[PDB]
Each structure stands twice: as structure tokens, then as C-alpha cells.
Ligand code: HEM
Ligand code: HEM
């Protein structure tokens with residue numbers, strides 16, 4: 001009847017009906033959409049019909065075995081035999097640890113919205129498929145946070161929890177990312193901290209968590225093990241490394257009293273592989289300066305520090321054409337890189353990150369004739385055409401294994 | 416067999432085969448492509464089969480008549496009657512000047528890649544459908560350039576030449592835009608002027624034009640009237656207004672000896688309306704600072720002045736993470752705006768241009784429940800997320816009337 005369109009800044013919604021008057025099918029491109037059903041993998045009620053699972057399974061195993069320089073046909077056939085049997089006999093199956101490792105890196109390799117993929121082959125895999133209690137999830141997450149942080153010398157890693165079985169027993173981290181600050185709706189009407197985590201900070205309060213009403217309070221882990229309700233777990237502060245923000249030249253910058261955590265880790269995505277799907281598999285890499293400097297600090301709906309920095313710099317923050325916003329955001333980006341470097345915490349500026357991806361993309365084409373890429377996500381939020389990825393045409397398709405989005409757990413899980 | 420992908424900076428080509436392994440049809444999005452066949456309207460050999468023309472014709476006339484606050488049903492029916500007859504009798508038809516005016520503004524209104532559409536209702540239409548000789552095209556173009564320039568107080572306008580009839584008699588401007596600088600492959604191997612117009616500067620040489628081997632030589636008009644070969648016409652220098660570039664603070668900026676023309680006008684697009692298609696209809700608006708400051712001056716494959724400005728600013732142009740590129744490009748953008756303002760030539764910075772489009776887009780939805788928009792083109796080449804359009808989801812569809820691309824005339828026209 002109409003397409004639903006959203007403004008992730010104002011939150012405002014629009015319904016598009018005009019597209020019904022569109023001309024002959026061309027190249028209604030839903031590419032500007034944040035969460036298209038196309039990139040989402042929702043709930044379940046029954047195991048994956050064997051008719052579909054076996055095909056994918058065979059497919060994956062052939063891919064896995066086809067990945068060797070010198071094939072192991074003997075083992076390959078045998079493995080196909082073994083897996084079929086395991087499915088006839090159990091209605092599902094288990095991946096060898098190596099297959100899991102291979103799946104996670106391949107899934108990463110197939111993330112069209114990830115610019116750090118030249119690092120794809122370098123990933124640490126924590127096998128927690130045997131986990132069974134929330135508390136165990138918590139301990140696993142902590143090991144992950146500790147390992148990945150590596151005292152500032154950030155390391156990429158992923159913790160794979162138990163694969164979805166019947167659909168009624170899914171392991172799910174309710175948080176969007178492992179580490180994230182809380183957002184509060186102060187009594188004086190103002191909002192403190194991360195305006196983006198307002199609702200989730202509430203869900204946390206509602207589950208017991210005690211709010212500290214700070215500007216930078218690390219939210220708690222809200223974990224649901226097996227299929228049971230989510231248990232709240234506060235993260236051990238010693239495990240959260242942070243960088244206090246200061247400018248290489250503006251001494252007043254630290255006066256802003258800003259800081260940010262060093263670990264960027266996705267907590268709410270599902271890993272689909274050869275028919276099996278893991279609804280809980282947090283993973284992490286290291287930051288790209290613009291994420292913090294531009295999105296986290298300058299988005300209207302986040303910490304929105306632009307005007308404050310503008311004034312401090314003595315810019316004409318009242319005349320848009322003065323381009324004061326372009327001057328401020330850049331100084332902020334400089335602060336972020338400078339601070340991470342100074343405190344020896346791994347980080348990469350967007351310019352070298354982009355050249356990095358270009359090299360990767362070229363490697364990918366030679367290697368396998370392609371690289372699924374989402375231009376809209378790969379092009380940095382600032383200095384777009386100054387970056388090489390901006391001038392590159394890209395094809396965006398969903399391969400497999402893959403990291404899908406999921407329906408927010410508090411929308412489908414029943415207490 | 417494989418999709419062809421291009422890098423508009425390096426010119427390099429890639430063939431994508433991997434997409435054949437893509438999963439169930441989701442939302443292979445060809446949205447990052449510059450010229451998709453979807454946005455192109457090529458040549459012809461025979462008139463538009465009456466079976467197709469009449470439908471569109473009726474459609475357009477209904478749209479046109481439906482556009483009034485207080486309908487003119489009497490006239491509407493009559494017009495439908497009259498048009499059908501004209502097609503049965505002549506196999507095509509003529510739009511009333513008002514319909515043409517309405518079509519051009521609507522076509523503009525439907526340009527998904529245009530950020531200046533809040534201005535859509537404000538357009539001057541020059542009716543040159545009666546033109547018949549190249550020389551007449553030339554005189555018409557000049558009137559257009561003169562009118563639009565209006566001594567710096569830029570005015571939007573379009574000159575509609577004769578609509579395509581049989582397909583073998585098309586009016587076509589061979590240039591991409593009315594005003595554009597030449598590019599030369601100097602004897603010492605270096606390239607002078609606009610590296611992007613190298614080939615076209617050659618086609619011009621080949622057709623007689625005498626090269627001035629300058630950094631800013633305005634190319635000549637290469638016009639093909641009726642269906643005949645293209646005649647070369649040099650633009651009267653008095654008609655080309657330019658802005659010499661200088662910085663509000665860096666006195667050395669003018670030492671760079673930079674300047675740019677004030678008129679941005681598209682010359683190679685086709686206007687499709689109610690079944691009729693005009694292969695020649697140059698139109699213009701006024702500049703958005705980033706076009707010149709970022710694309711024209713800083714693209715590698717254009718004037719590529721970034722490193723030079725970096726050094727002048729005394730930046731660490733050898734350490735990418737210093738973000739010197741972000742500092743330089745901004746100063747350049749400042750020079751562009753400053754210079755146009757100083758010399759009283761209309762121009763708009765990208766920040767106010769974006770808010771402008773947001774207001775327009777919101778007006779469009781209320782007005783007609785939609786606004787075809789191409790996020791990839793609408794988001795400025797610098798400071799993307801600092802702009803409101805970056806956070807807006809958009810639907811990109813091809814309505815009608817519409818401005819399509821065409822196959823470069825020197826590829827299909829036969830001498
Ligand atoms: C090693 C350094 C890495 C860097 C610099 C990097 C950088 C980025 C950046 C800049 C984004 C944009 C995020 C946003 O705008 O919200 C992103 C998205 C993403 N990254 Fe990477 N990444 C890295 C490692 C990883 C790893 C190890 C994985 C998986 C195992 C991965 C999976 C993804 C996925 C799936 C997305 C999409 C997130 C979403 O759609 O919300 N990345 N990454
Ligand atoms: C009045 C001020 C105007 C402004 C500021 C404006 C601005 C822009 C900008 C920034 C672009 C990007 C061009 C590029 O990156 O190559 C663009 C594209 C475009 N504009 Fe507008 N425009 C204006 C008027 C017009 C008018 C009067 C028309 C038509 C009658 C129009 C039709 C288009 C079309 C069709 C494109 C697509 C060009 C392409 O695909 O190569 N614009 N405009």
C-alpha cells in the first residue's frame with residue numbers, strides 16, 4: 001500500500017505512495033534503508049525443514065573443503081557422508097571447530113557494510129557453543145572483552161554461542177553492542193549521556209539495574225540463555241578500557257570532559273552458515289576514528305557536541321555558510337585520533353581505512369571475482385569524495401555465510 | 416555472465432561474477448552505478464509505435480489537467496480529443512507551451528539526483544522547438560547563457576529544442592555541459608587543464624577547433640542540428656562569467672591562479688514527457704560550493720589541487736592520519752564560497768543546500784506522498800553525516816516526465 005521511510009536523526013516517519021506511479025522496472029531501490037527485511041533473520045518455532053537444511057549443509061561443506069590449496073577429497077566425501085547422517089539421525093548438525101572458524105571469517109568477509117575486511121582472515125574464535133546458563137554467557141563475554149582489549153592493542157574476536165535448534169531456545173544478547181553508554185531523561189527535561197540508548201537504559205532500569213545518571217555510564221549486559229528470560233549483568237569496570245579526549249593544540253578540549261570506550265563490538269547479530277544459524281555471536285574489531293569523532297560525538301541524536309566546539313574555536317556558529325561545522329568536526333576527529341594514539345589504543349583514521357578497503361576489494365576480485373559492498377555504509381561520514389571508495393562502483397549482494405540483523409529480542413521473546 | 420564495475424577515479428574496470436552466488440532475492444543492488452541502462456534513453460529508427468505513444472500521451476494530459484486548483488474538465492476532455500486526433504493524423508503531437516513548461520518543471524521535480532529541487536517551480540523555459548539549423552541552436556544557446564548568467568545573479572532556465580520524430584533527425588549537443596574547460600595532453604607528458612575533458616577536447620580539435628593549451632580554456636559548442644553532423648561553435652568569451660579564486664585569509668591562495676565559471680548547465684540529457692522525447696534540452700541552475708571546491712578542484716582525475724594547498728598551509732601532507740586533507744579541502748571550499756560571494760555571483764554552500772532539500776522533500780510528501788531521491792547523489796562529497804540528508808532514508812524511482820541520460824552521440828551518430 002505504501003513504503004515506510006525513516007529519518008534516523010529526527011526519528012520522524014514518512015509513508016511513500018508516490019512510488020506506485022513508478023515507470024517500467026529499471027535497476028524502487030530500497031538501498032537507503034537501514035534495516036531492510038532483506039538483511040534481517042527473524043525468530044522461529046520449528047527446526048529448519050530438513051529439505052532445506054541438507055542442501056545448504058552440503059553446500060557449505062563443499063565450500064569449506066573447496067577452500068584448501070590441496071584438496072582432501074577423501075575427507076571431503078567422508079564429511080559429506082557424515083553430515084547427512086547426522087541430520088537424518090538428529091535433524092541438524094555440528095560444525096568442526098575449523099568449519100566454525102572458517103564460517104565466521106567468511107561471514108565477516110561477506111559483510112558488505114564493513115570497511116575493515118582486509119583484516120577478515122585475522123579473527124580469534126571463542127567456541128561457547130556448549131554454554132548453557134546466562135552466567136556462563138557473562139563469563140564468556142568477559143573473557144572476550146578482556147582478550148579483545150588486550151590492554152589497548154586491540155584484537156578482533158568473536159564468541160559463538162549455541163546455534164538455534166527449535167527456535168524456542170535461542171541465546172540472545174539484548175544489547176546492540178558489548179560496550180555502550182547509558183542515556184537518561186533528566187528531571188529537568190534534559191537528556192544526559194547517549195540520547196540513543198534512552199529506551200534500552202530504561203529496559204535495564206526496569207530489570208533491576210541501578211542508574212548512575214552519568215554522562216558516560218557503561219550499560220549492563222542483558223543476557224537471555226537457552227530461551228529463558230534475560231538476566232542483567234553489570235560489566236566489571238576494570239574490563240572497560242576508555243580514552244579521555246584531548247586536543248593536540250586546544251588545551252580547552254579536555255575541559256569538555258569527553259571520553260570514549262576503546263572496544264567496538266556488535267552484540268545483536270545472527271550468523272547464518274550452511275543452514276545453521278547462531279542468534280548469539282558477539283564480535284569486535286577496532287575503531288575507525290570517524291565513528292566516534294563524527295557519529296558518536298557529532299550526530300544530533302547522540303552526544304551532539306558540534307556547536308559547543310564551534311564556540312570554543314571562536315567560529316561563526318551562526319552563519320552556516322561559514323562552514324564552521326566542517327572546521328569543528330575535523331578538530332574533533334583530530335582529538336579522537338590524537339587521544340587514542342597518545343594512550344596507545346589501536347585506532348585507524350578513515351583515509352587509510354579507505355585505501356585499506358580498496359586494496360582489499362581488489363584482492364577480493366582477483367581471488368574470487370567479487371566483493372559484496374554497500375557504498376552507502378563504506379563511504380565515511382566526512383570527506384567522502386576525498387576518499388577513494390567514493391569513486392568506486394560497487395555491487396551489494398547477500399552471500400552466505402552471513403551476519404544478519406535480527407528482530408529486537410524484547411519484541412518477540414515472551415516472559 | 417558478469418556485471419561490469421567501474422572506478423571513476425582510476426578509470427579501472429572490474430567484472431563481477433561472484434554475485435551469481437547471491438542468496439534469495441532480497442531488497443544485487445545496482446545503486447552505486449553511475450550510468451545504469453535504467454537511467455539511459457538511447458537512439459531510434461522509427462517513430463514511437465502509436466500503441467505506446469497514445470497511452471502515455473493521454474496519461475500526461477490527464478496529469479497536466481489534473482494539476483489545476485480548479486479543473487477545466489471542458490478543456491481537458493477537448494484536449495484529450497484533440498491530441499488523439501493529432502496522433503491518428505500525424506502519428507505524434509505538439510504540447511501547448513504551457514504543457515511544455517509544466518513538463519520541464521515536473522521532470523526537474525522528478526530528478527532523484529538533484530538537491531536543488533526546492534526551486535523546481537521556478538524555471539524559465541525557452542521554446543526552440545522550431546529551431547532547424549545548428550547556427551540557430553548556437554544563437555539559442557547564447558541567449559540562454561546570457562539570460563541564465565544575468566550578470567552573476569544566476570537564473571535557472573532550459574532551452575527545449577525539437578522533439579525526436581523518427582529518430583534519425585535528433586538535435587544533440589555533443590558537450591556534456593554548456594560551459595566546461597579543455598584538457599590537454601602536453602608534450603612533456605603532463606596534462607594541463609581539466610583532465611576529465613581530454614577525449615572531448617580531442618574531438619573538438621579533430622573538428623577544426625584551435626587549442627589554446629591553457630589551464631582554463633572554455634571548450635567550444637559542438638552542435639548537431641536535425642540529424643546532420645555536428646558543427647563546432649566557439650562560445651563568445653563575453654558570455655562566460657568567471658570567478659577568480661581567493662581566500663579570505665590566505666593571501667597565497669590567489670597565487671594558485673585558480674578560477675571557475677559561474678554557470679552549471681547540463682547539455683547532454685533527454686527530456687521524456689507524455690510519450691514525446693527531446694534529445695536536446697540544455698538546462699541550468701546555480702552552483703553548490705562543493706561541486707567546485709571538492710569535486711572540480713580536489714578530485715584526483717580533475718584539477719587535483721589538494722597536495723599543493725596542503726603544503727601551502729604547511730600541513731603534514733605526508734602523514735595521512737594527520738587529516739591534512741580534511742583541513743585543506745575545507746579551506747578550498749571556503750575560498751570558493753568567499754570568492755563567489757565577493758564577486759556577487761550566486762552560489763549556495765552544501766549545508767544550507769541540504770536543509771533546503773529536506774524542507775523540499777517534506778513538502779513533496781505532503782503534496783504528493785513521495786519524492787524520488789538518490790541518497791548517493793544527494794549527500795555532499797564532504798561532511799556527509801553533518802548534513803541532515805545523510806540521516807534520511809530515501810526511495811529512488813523513475814517517474815515521468817523525466818530527464819534521462821543518453822548514449823554519447825559520437826558513439827551512435829553516423830557521418
Ligand atoms: C578489525 C577492524 C575493523 C574495523 C576498522 C571495522 C570497521 C567497521 C565500521 C567503520 C563499520 C561501520 C559501523 C557503523 O557505522 O555502525 C563496520 C560495520 C560492520 N563490521 Fe567491521 N570493522 C572491523 C572488524 C570487524 C570484524 C572482526 C567483524 C566480524 C567478525 C566485522 C563485522 C562488521 C559488520 C557485520 C558490520 C555491519 C554493522 C551493522 O550493519 O550495523 N567488522 N565495521
Ligand atoms: C537552482 C539551483 C540548482 C542547484 C543548486 C542544483 C544542484 C545540483 C547538484 C549539486 C547536482 C550534482 C551534480 C553532480 O554531482 O554532477 C545536480 C544534479 C542534477 N540537477 Fe540540479 N540543481 C539546480 C537546478 C537544476 C535545474 C534548474 C534542473 C533542471 C531543469 C536540474 C536538474 C538536475 C539533474 C537532472 C541532475 C542530474 C545530473 C546527472 O545525473 O549528471 N537542477 N543538481
Ligand SMILES: Cc1cc(N)nc(CCNC(=O)c2ccc(C#N)cc2)c1
Pocket residue numbers: 177196264265266283284285286287288291
Ligand atoms: C565490529 C565493529 C568494528 C567497528 N570499528 N565498529 C563497529 C560498529 C558497531 N556499532 C556501533 O558501535 C554503534 C552503532 C549505532 C549506534 C547508534 N546510534 C551506536 C554505536 C563494529
Ligand SMILES: Cc1cc(N)nc(CCNC(=O)c2ccc(C#N)cc2)c1
Pocket residue numbers: 592611679680681698699700701702703706
Ligand atoms: C543543473 C545543474 C546545477 C548544478 N548546481 N550542477 C550541475 C552539474 C552539471 N554537471 C557538471 O557540472 C559536471 C559533471 C561531471 C564532471 C566531471 N568529471 C564535471 C562537471 C547541474
Ligand SMILES: CCCCCCCCO[C@@H]1O[C@H](CO)[C@@H](O)[C@H](O)[C@H]1O
Pocket residue numbers: 058062065066071072073074076077080
Ligand atoms: C549431493 C552431494 C554431492 C557432493 C559431491 C562432492 C564432490 C567433491 O567436490 C570436490 O571437492 C574438492 C575438495 O574436497 C574440491 O577441491 C573440488 O573442486 C570439488 O569438485
Ligand SMILES: CCCCCCCCO[C@@H]1O[C@H](CO)[C@@H](O)[C@H](O)[C@H]1O
Pocket residue numbers: 473477480481486487488489491492495
Ligand atoms: C481513455 C481516456 C479517458 C480520459 C478520461 C478523462 C476524465 C477526466 O479526468 C478528470 O480531469 C480533471 C481535470 O480536467 C481532474 O481534476 C479529475 O480529477 C480527473 O478525474
Ligand SMILES: C[C@H](O)[C@H](O)[C@@H]1CNc2nc(N)[nH]c(=O)c2N1
Pocket residue numbers: 008032033034376377378805806807808809
Ligand atoms: C539513512 C542512511 O542509510 C543512514 O543514516 C546511514 C548511511 N550510511 C551509514 N554508514 C555507516 N557506516 N553507518 C551508518 O550508520 C550509516 N547510516
Ligand SMILES: C[C@H](O)[C@H](O)[C@@H]1CNc2nc(N)[nH]c(=O)c2N1
Pocket residue numbers: 390391392393394423447448449791792793
Ligand atoms: C561511484 C559513485 O556512484 C560515484 O563516484 C559518485 C557518487 N555520488 C555522486 N554524487 C554526486 N552528486 N555527483 C557525483 O558525481 C557522484 N558520483
